[PDB]
Amino acid sequence: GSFVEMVDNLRGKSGQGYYVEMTVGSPPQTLNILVDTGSSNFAVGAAPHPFLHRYYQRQLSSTYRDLRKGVYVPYTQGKWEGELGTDLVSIPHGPNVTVRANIAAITESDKFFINGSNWEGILGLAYAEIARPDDSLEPFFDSLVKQTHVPNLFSLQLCGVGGSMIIGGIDHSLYTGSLWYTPIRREWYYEVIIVRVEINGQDLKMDCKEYNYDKSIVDSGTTNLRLPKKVFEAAVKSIKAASSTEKFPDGFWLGEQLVCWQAGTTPWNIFPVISLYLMGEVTNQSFRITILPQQYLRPVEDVATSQDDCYKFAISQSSTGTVMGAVIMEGFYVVFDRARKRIGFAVSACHVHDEFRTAAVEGPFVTLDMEDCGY
Numbered sequence: 001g002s003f004v005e006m007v008d009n010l011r012g013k014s015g016q017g018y019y020v021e022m023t024v025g026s027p028p029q030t031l032n033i034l035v036d037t038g039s040s041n042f043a044v045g046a047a048p049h050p051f052l053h054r055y056y057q058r059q060l061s062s063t064y065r066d067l068r069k070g071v072y073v074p075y076t077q078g079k080w081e082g083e084l085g086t087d088l089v090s091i092p093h094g095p096n097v098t099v100r101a102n103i104a105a106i107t108e109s110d111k112f113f114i115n116g117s118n119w120e121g122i123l124g125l126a127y128a129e130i131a132r133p134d135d136s137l138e139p140f141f142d143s144l145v146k147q148t149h150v151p152n153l154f155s156l157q158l159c160g161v162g163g164s165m166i167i168g169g170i171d172h173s174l175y176t177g178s179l180w181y182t183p184i185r186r187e188w189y190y191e192v193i194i195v196r197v198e199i200n201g202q203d204l205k206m207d208c209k210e211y212n213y214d215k216s217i218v219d220s221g222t223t224n225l226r227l228p229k230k231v232f233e234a235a236v237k238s239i240k241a242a243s244s245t246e247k248f249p250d251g252f253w254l255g256e257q258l259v260c261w262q263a264g265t266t267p268w269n270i271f272p273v274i275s276l277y278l279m280g281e282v283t284n285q286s287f288r289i290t291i292l293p294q295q296y297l298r299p300v301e302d303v304a305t306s307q308d309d310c311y312k313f314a315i316s317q318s319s320t321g322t323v324m325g326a327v328i329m330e331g332f333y334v335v336f337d338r339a340r341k342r343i344g345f346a347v348s349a350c351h352v353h354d355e356f357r358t359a360a361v362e363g364p365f366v367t368l369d370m371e372d373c374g375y
């Protein structure tokens with residue numbers, strides 16, 4: 001159960017998240033579970049569904065304990081409902097431990113499971129404040145920490161699929177260069193502060209609070225980089241200007257349609273780099289993470305369109321603040337240092353580059369003219 005044995009423990013389908021193998025109950029029932037830093041519930045399919053390969057059968061587990069409490073989770077894009085209980089949980093390619101944890105057994109859902117995603121539940125890695133029904137339902141990671149000697153930290157290396165989730169430590173073979181830390185502003189979602197945004201080195205010149213309206217989070221459970229309306233509109237204007245040698249339909253910029261090029265001819269050079277400057281651990285100091293088009297133009301695999309390489313624009317508008325989703329995390333080694341209330345970023349071993357540009361994590365940067373960038 002060493003970090004080496006944890007490397008390459010994630011798999012996934014593009015736009016459908018990354019999952020880890022887990023076991024639930026006694027005797028153990030193997031399930032694939034999506035790793036979600038944007039939620040705090042451990043919620044698993046517990047009844048048949050057209051999109052489920054398998055599901056949690058509580059009647060077969062002697063260690064199952066019913067909490068006699070229902071949970072109903074309607075959210076913007078769908079819903080899930082279930083029953084709360086506790087059971088024995090393990091991660092075969094994770095720490096060499098078995099813990100007793102809360103489990104929300106999903107008995108009914110709407111647009112939650114995805115056809116052929118290969119996962120049957122979600123592991124919410126964020127804090128109790130956002131747990132459903134309320135903050136009294138201890139999240140999985142909290143239980144893992146309380147019950148074992150596992151250090152209060154985990155890291156994600158998402159590769160654009162596969163990757164690694166390292167529990168209880170930092171694996172140096174997963175990144176190059178330096179780890180730069182940004183503070184966790186509040187322990188609910190993994191909330192952070194963006195202090196500056198540049199598109200091909202050009203500052204968006206907005207008050208930095210706009211970038212964090214009403215919060216900015218790091219979410220492995222969201223595919224896109226999602227931006228507040230004002231920021232999204234300025235970003236699109238700037239990307240369109242940089243890429244103006246080619247004109248795309250409005251639907252492409254809305255994520256409503258694909259852009260396709262003859263296989264291997266994607267004009268990466270016409271698309272700009274996006275730099276997100278994150279608040280440093282010291283006053284008015286920041287570092288930047290740079291995103292290439294290979295990260296924000298998400299390939300859509302489809303045998304029918306395979307004479308071409310087709311992409312969806314993976315930057316979208318949000319009315320609930322910035323979401324640094326999978327397209328941002330890909331090619332960075334992201335350290336969720338809960339013990340030190342900070343999130344670390346470093347260039348990943350599976351980072352993005354072509355022969356002209358490389359994703360980067362760079363600093364420090366100084367801004368003497370700064371106000372508080374948070375809401």
Ligand SMILES: NC1=N[C@](c2ccnc(C(F)(F)F)c2)(c2ccc(F)c(-c3cncnc3)c2)c2cccc(F)c21
Pocket residue numbers: 015016017018034036037038039040041042043073075077080112113114122123124219220221222223
């Ligand atoms: N971050 C999130 N996890 C949720 C979510 C919403 C409500 N409850 C949960 C639960 F069950 F984990 F608590 C998760 C989720 C649910 C189902 C999914 F298929 C996916 C997903 C992830 N990656 C790629 N494609 C789809 C995400 C979800 C839905 C909407 C916005 C979000 F930011 C999230």
Ligand code: NA
Pocket residue numbers: 014160295298299327330
């Ligand atoms: Na991708």
